Amino acid sequence: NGVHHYTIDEFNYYYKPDRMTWHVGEKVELTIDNRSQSAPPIAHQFSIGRTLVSRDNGFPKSQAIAVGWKDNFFDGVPITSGGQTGPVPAFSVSLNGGQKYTFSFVVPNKPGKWEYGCFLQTGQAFMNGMHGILDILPAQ
Ligand SMILES: [Cu+]
Known about the structure:
Elements: E1 3-11, E2 14-16, E3 19-23, E4 27-34, E5 44-54, E6 66-72, E7 78-81, E8 84-87, E9 93-95, E10 100-106, E11 112-117, H1 124-127, E12 131-137
Parallel strand pairs: 1-4, 3-12
Antiparallel strand pairs: 1-2, 4-10, 5-6, 5-9, 5-11, 7-8, 11-12
Bound molecules: copper (I) ion.
């Protein structure tokens, strides 16, 4: 019934936590915190989606160069952050080291498995394992 607060921390090259479960209709406040530990710290991205878009050159790859999600989880989802309210097209949280960002939303009716990932560094963060699984359940 109330606002559920989640925090996702970013490190080189992983999210804590790397798994999260929400219910359709849940009120979520989410903090994304770039805790990049390197010297210097590196920028990290948080984007939730489905259908990995990768580069192609006609030549096969043990690892696909990730560029982003085709389907964005936040497509059409009203977001509130500071004094701003409404949907954000192509919503993504990109942060330098030491920056964080908090926003809230109601979990849209998009049940099933979504992924979160970082595509900075031409997909290198992703390819080094910077991704997580979001499971969306129907409302209780
Ligand atoms: Cu990253």
